[PDB]
Amino acid sequence: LLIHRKGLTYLHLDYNFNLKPTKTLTTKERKKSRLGNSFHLMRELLKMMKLIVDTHVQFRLGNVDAFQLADGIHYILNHIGQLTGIYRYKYKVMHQIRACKDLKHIIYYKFNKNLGKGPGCGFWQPAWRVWLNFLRGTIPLLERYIGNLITRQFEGRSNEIVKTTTKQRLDAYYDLELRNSVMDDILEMMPES
Amino acid sequence: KIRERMLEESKRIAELQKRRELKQAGINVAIKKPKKKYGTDIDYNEDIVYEQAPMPGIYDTSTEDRQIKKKFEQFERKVNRKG
Amino acid sequence: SRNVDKANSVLVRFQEQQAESAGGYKDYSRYQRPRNVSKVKSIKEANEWKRQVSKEIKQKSTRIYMQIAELNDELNNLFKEWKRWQWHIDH
Amino acid sequence: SWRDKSAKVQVKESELPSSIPAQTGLTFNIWYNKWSQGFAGNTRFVSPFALQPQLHSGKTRGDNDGQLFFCLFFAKGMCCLGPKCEYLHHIPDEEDIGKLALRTEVLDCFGREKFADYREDMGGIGSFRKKNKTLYVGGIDGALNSKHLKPAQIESRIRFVFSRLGDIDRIRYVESKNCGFVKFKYQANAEFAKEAMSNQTLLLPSDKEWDDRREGTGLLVKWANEDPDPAAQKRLQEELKLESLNMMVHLINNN
Amino acid sequence: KISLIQIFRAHLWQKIHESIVFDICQILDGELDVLQIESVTKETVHPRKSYKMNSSAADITMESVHEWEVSKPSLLHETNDSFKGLITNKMWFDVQLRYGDYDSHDISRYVRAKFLDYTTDNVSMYPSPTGVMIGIDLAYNMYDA
Amino acid sequence: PRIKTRRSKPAPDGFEKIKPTLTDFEIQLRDAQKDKSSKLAAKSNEQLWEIMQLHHQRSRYIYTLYYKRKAISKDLYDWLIKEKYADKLLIAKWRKTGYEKLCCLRCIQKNETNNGSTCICRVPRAQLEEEARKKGTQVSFHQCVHCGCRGCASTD
Amino acid sequence: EPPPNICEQCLGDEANIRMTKIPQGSECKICTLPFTLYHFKTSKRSNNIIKTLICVRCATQRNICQCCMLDSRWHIPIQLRDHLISLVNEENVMTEEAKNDMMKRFLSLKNVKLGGAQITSDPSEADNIVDKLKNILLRVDISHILKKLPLNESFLKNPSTKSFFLYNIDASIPEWKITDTVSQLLGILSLIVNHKAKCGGLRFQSSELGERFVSKIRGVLLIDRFRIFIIPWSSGFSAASFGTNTAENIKLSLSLNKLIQLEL
Amino acid sequence: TTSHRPQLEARSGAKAAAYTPTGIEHARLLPGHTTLKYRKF
Amino acid sequence: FTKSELKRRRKTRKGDGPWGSWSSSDYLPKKVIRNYPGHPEGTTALKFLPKTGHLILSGGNDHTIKIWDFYHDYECLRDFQGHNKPIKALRFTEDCQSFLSSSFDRSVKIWDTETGKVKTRLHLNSTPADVESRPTNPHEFIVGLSNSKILHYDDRVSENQGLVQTYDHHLSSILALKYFPDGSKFISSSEDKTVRIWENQINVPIKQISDTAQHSMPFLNVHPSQNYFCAQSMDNRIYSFSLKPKYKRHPKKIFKGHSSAGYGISLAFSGDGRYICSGDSKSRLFTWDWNTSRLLNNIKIPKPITQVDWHPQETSKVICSGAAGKIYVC
Amino acid sequence: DILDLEELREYQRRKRTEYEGYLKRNRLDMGQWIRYAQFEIEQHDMRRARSIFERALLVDSSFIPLWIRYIDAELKVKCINHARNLMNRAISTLPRVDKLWYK
Amino acid sequence: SERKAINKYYPPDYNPLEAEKLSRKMAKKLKTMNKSHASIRLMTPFSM
Amino acid sequence: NLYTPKAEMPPEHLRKIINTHSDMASKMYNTDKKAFLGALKYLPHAILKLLENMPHPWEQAKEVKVLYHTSGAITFVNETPRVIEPVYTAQWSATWIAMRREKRDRTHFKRMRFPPF
Ligand SMILES: O=P(O)(O)O[C@H]1[C@H](OP(=O)(O)O)[C@@H](OP(=O)(O)O)[C@H](OP(=O)(O)O)[C@@H](OP(=O)(O)O)[C@H]1OP(=O)(O)O
Ligand SMILES: [Zn+2]
Ligand SMILES: [Zn+2]
Ligand SMILES: [Zn+2]
Ligand SMILES: [Zn+2]
Ligand SMILES: [Zn+2]
């Protein structure tokens, strides 16, 4: 609905939450459809949740047994970096990914002692904790982000955006203030006004 | 830019002359108003766009007000029939 | 690349084909007008081609105001074409 | 009388038309309920449904609930709820105009809120400034499927269909402009008849064209502009003076 | 991306798959009486099948005049597989294309894993419990079955 | 109801003798679940009213059987409550004086009404009738928005 | 923030009205700017919900109710009010309304009353206006169709006629007044009138209705002392009877006019 | 050259005062240093 | 109110619960060759023999069925008198020894073609609107009804009057049925604005046909090339659809020009494939080219011609009839 | 040039759009304000002319040629009492400018 | 979507070979596929 | 003034509401579409609540209390997964031992494919 209200029907959202263009886009279409990190973070979190829910659905259909389910949940939580692409819009999630990798190492080398290689390790509780504690701090950020986006959708954009003095604007603003200073001095001292 | 202005006036005079021909042919087409570039754009003929009336002073203006109204409506009838 | 070769991409053309099949949608301005009118059988689509001739003569007549001779020639030729379309839907 | 019978169900719930309009683009927009990616083909179509006042009128829940407003879909000849409808299923009459006489300044007889300015199209609900009683009737060629018909014959058709829908002041047909003007006694009947006759055909069952009546575009019924005829203008001034003199009586007797 | 779609331009992947499927079918025809085959059927497979990388179907389906003795699954170049174990009258050939990389260009491991994965789903991909998967690696130009 | 699982214990004796009635209630609810794709808001509300009625009626079956007919053991009643064939908290309302025929719990949730009142369907019909007569009209209330109930005062 | 401006006729006669306030809930119908919406019902069980359509500063600018836009002293619409005042004042005043949206927003914020509002916004002026108002109340194919029209024959008892021809119709007369007076005479009827022709035709449901019509008083019919004249039209009529174009209708009207002036 | 101009007057802040805020949550306007210090006296 | 009066008031509610109501209410053809003396009150169904058309089967009003020869005498061989109501549909089983008959009497009867013997008879709870049978099996038949069910029968089965299965995915009355010429799948159309394709003896439709502007389709048939099928929609246009496993419509195969609405007009195909035909309410026997949907001609044959049928070998020959009773041959 | 009232309306729309655009982009050009007001005096629409002079005064009330133009414009069209109100206002806001007193 | 998107959406029924064959049939009737020149941006190679 | 606890609805009611909001083409769904877009800011909270209540390997089917908007816009899992820490440790230790034994004993462990659908 957010895609369609913005008129971007030339973008399609898969039922596994990939966003793909339906056609090669014009430049005006590309500028008009340039969705931001708020949308994409939301989309990829839905994608992650979709993967987890789909494994439970597979278990409940009888397609995979409980051990396969445990291993699947563990694999998803360890391989968010490959399955989800969420780092592209929030690169600080690499801490979570790195923590999951470290946890996988210590869990495996406790688990696989005298077993050897191959799938089967379903002890998914630590990585699960990592991602929940990430969601803790991601809730206020995404609430602010998505709120501002949807506010722009309904209320529209503020008329009076005051640009700050960043270093790209520094010299121009210096010139304006210097010019005004010279003009104030000379128009004050001239007798004829 | 002056080339663009020339072309714009060419298109305007095209519409004007075509409207005049059709008026001589007895099919009275109305002139097309310009398209609004944005939803809140202004047509300056519909209203006195930001009317700031003179603040009323001590002297009565009524007689010369109705005289000015007479003058304006006379001019309007004149341009209607004489062009 | 430009708008034109994006619009003439295989995906866009296939979507146009699917839309004219699935819902009857066809932007006639994309397509070359029939030279011979009599091969057109529907009153609806013949009238739509007539509309194309109409918007064409409007856009040409905007440019009439070598130039006058060639554009007058094309203008009266398009009026001949318009006559043929009106004749065809009238018969 | 319509009071003697319960209202007929005009159209069954399963017989109602789809909400998705005819395709005019490549993709259906789930927000706007309209087609995106291109805009080609006309959006007008002939209504499958038409009101039949003597047949379809009758009592509803609205008469028992003390309702004021008329059913929009009854006028369109496609009300699904029939006697269970909250809204009134009959042609407006002086009783109901009297009941509407407070709300009528800012509301339609259908209970829709009026606007300050008319649409540029002169379509839609109408202005609370004007209190217009006159409908423009265009698209008459499409309403007849381009059938050739004499002007008095067209006028007789327009006279028949609009006179079912209220008390009428004037009907005139203009051959040169190929358009009709219908003026009602009450603005509520003009409001009603506009929605009742919008997108309809003028064809008859007796016509040879009747079996393909759905193919074109129907009647184009809009609010009329002020009549530029000087006779009509001085008539308008006379009735304005009469309305003013009648109102002086009320102001004086109240104060 | 540009270089690899330039190599695989004009649907070369599907062309490779179709041509190899046809080659295996057309040489199985020349041994129909030798292998006691009642019929060799090239399957009308969905167009995305050639690059459907998580699912599969039979490319060729093959009927027996009288039932075959078949081995437990084994690679193309293993020699001691014995036919006494199992009996069947229908078999399939599945042709899988891959584009390998430095981590994975042991096509034998790929075909073994894909076979044991696909043939043991809850929902059966194939028209019979017995068959052969053939694999071709396009990046490294290798084959196994 | 709650899906059968290792979590759940087997049904006590007597569940087999009431199972046909419960299964038909299940059948009706399975039918009512579906996307019938109603176009109108009014008829879309009516389809939720159907579900609320079915919920009420199955709970009334179990309620009358246990508390009034006394044809059901405490063990079987506890099992039906635990597996949620019956609404626990609505049955708790039917046990109270003045609520013996209550339709649903939302219609007495005073803290979410605009005026802080109950739903109008809990007014006795005679009171609405005499108010309408004193005003000089028929009664305008037909069905309440929450569940489609037409009146569930215990006098009615 | 000013209080809502709602008239008693909107509020009704119940002793207490509950009203719901919604800050910035609605956009004003006159000026498009947001405002505090009020909405209420006249009683709890009334089924229509009344809401403020215009903001308070637009309402005070015009001296009107926010819920029905009638004048908050005289309970009449702006056009009729400004017309009434401009009969008592020689110099006309009218409510000039903005058409551009920026001018709509601009006009609403200037705190100056508009049109007839100031003349009605205090009792002294409004009472003076009504005192003066009391003084005001104290003070070409015609040659063919004229044989299709029944003009040679007369209003009679004996011939059973279901259809009639009407002429000397003044253009002021609406169609409904004609049907209404025939309804009064019959104690209750397809009518065609062409006002550019100044004539028309009346067709009854069955012959006994036409006979009852001719039973009550070439004949005459009265509409506010306009003397519509009436003739039995045995030959059936249609809309074509009065001419196929506007010019034919006008020519027919002049012909009928000179025929009337001869008859009188 | 006419796109490229000096500043004759600056934009007046009175224009921004003429209409209401539109509810965008800026990060720098989130709560912070919520208690004022006061001096000894 | 007294308690007794409240008790009586409770009993007046239309319902035994809180939802009880208080409410008040309680090649090209050219010209006609001959005509047979069909049913005087009107013919409602016609059929040629399926593989070789030497005989014409007829049913209509006057509650009777009759069979005529197409050569050498042009006379009725025999009549079948066993119906109480007008014949709705007739269908020769795919082995010519028998034909199915349905009528508005809610009775479906299968008759021996050569002897005129009722092989079996079915009584139904709803009016049948079509009867059809498998190309692979003469004993198997199917019946579409007004109550939106489709009953399936094999006459060898005695259990439950031979009802082998029932289909349910239709919200209103069935109007037409047709097997694929292979007979493994069948098609059905409904009063509900949709058509379905079904696996034989399976209660799940393998495809659904729907569009935002689709009208109902009271008749359906297969083109002799069998790659395509066709139906007469109430839009006064005939439509054609693929029988290939995609089952999608084909875009330019629209067939307009005939007044169909409110009548069960039939559509028929030339045996060479290349031409198609339909009736009309005002008796114009229309024809079209199948290759390009181009119009061919109409004949003003002596009234609604609801039935048409085309001979499997006699090129340019077609039969028609309707309420006029007489059965005209071109 | 112009043969019809509708054509006059088109001309007036174009010129008004031009002048209003420039005065939107740069309001401090007092000469531009003056000649826009002069344009509306040429159209004989004194309400518009008065409004433009008033807006120009709101941009800068201290600029004496703008006051003199407005006063002279009122007097040129015989609107003496308007001019009297205007001159009284002029001296009332700028009492130390000799030119307004002399005018 | 970004400039360097890897994937475009194909409908589930999309056969690429049939799509190209249909688009080839369509290409012979489109105006801008059959006009006689290609628009380009270029520098003037010499003074003229 | 006075409080009573939130009524718990039949689950079929919520199920119906999600089913009916499948297409949302009719004009009756405009307010619902707006509610859907306003729900979007609360999705990460709902995602946290769902994943937080995820079934552990030893339980087949976890019934959870939910809070849902009557437009169908969003469903929150409205409960906290409280556990007894020595019991939770014992449960996960049993799960650990069982999974170890299964990796040992199962000749071929067939992993899932991702995305599963
Ligand atoms: O890159 P790592 O984090 O270390 O993990 C690698 C694998 O993960 P992926 O690269 O995603 O496939 C993992 O299998 P998975 O987790 O997928 O089930 C293997 O575990 P095992 O074979 O099942 O025991 C590891 O083998 P060990 O080295 O014995 O830990 C392997 O390490 P390696 O890359 O050094 O060989
Ligand atoms: Zn209704
Ligand atoms: Zn209740
Ligand atoms: Zn309830
Ligand atoms: Zn209730
Ligand atoms: Zn306002």
Ligand SMILES: [Zn+2]
């Ligand atoms: Zn009011």
